Amino acid sequence: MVSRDQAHLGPKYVGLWDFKSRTDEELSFRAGDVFHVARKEEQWWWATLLDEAGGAVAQGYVPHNYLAERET
């Protein structure tokens, strides 16, 4: 989805290595899915797995070493 207006920065993120967890510390989703960061910490990064419609679904936090940003 191309964005004509760029008033708010914050592209989608992808990179779960097809890892499915059950705890909150980890995200229960596979790679290929796009997500956005809810909180940026110096230690760990917060991510939220949203459905194809964009509605939030999964919640958790993981290091950038796991998921990589996907600039437009």
- Domains plus CATH for the chain? 1-72 (2.30.30.40)
Q: How was this structure determined?
A: NMR
CA separation for the pair 44, 4 (Å, rounded): 31
Instruction: Give the CA-trace dihedral at 54, 60, 27, 34, to 10 degrees.
Output: 30
Beta-carbon contacts of 72 under 8 Å, excluding residues fewer than 6 positions away, are 2, 3, 11
What is the CB neighbour count within 10 angstroms for residue 72?
8
Spatial separation of the C-alpha atoms in residues 34 and 30, rounded to whole Å: 10
Q: Distance between CA atoms of 46 and 5, rounded to whole angstroms?
A: 25
Contact 29, 21 (CB under 8 A): no
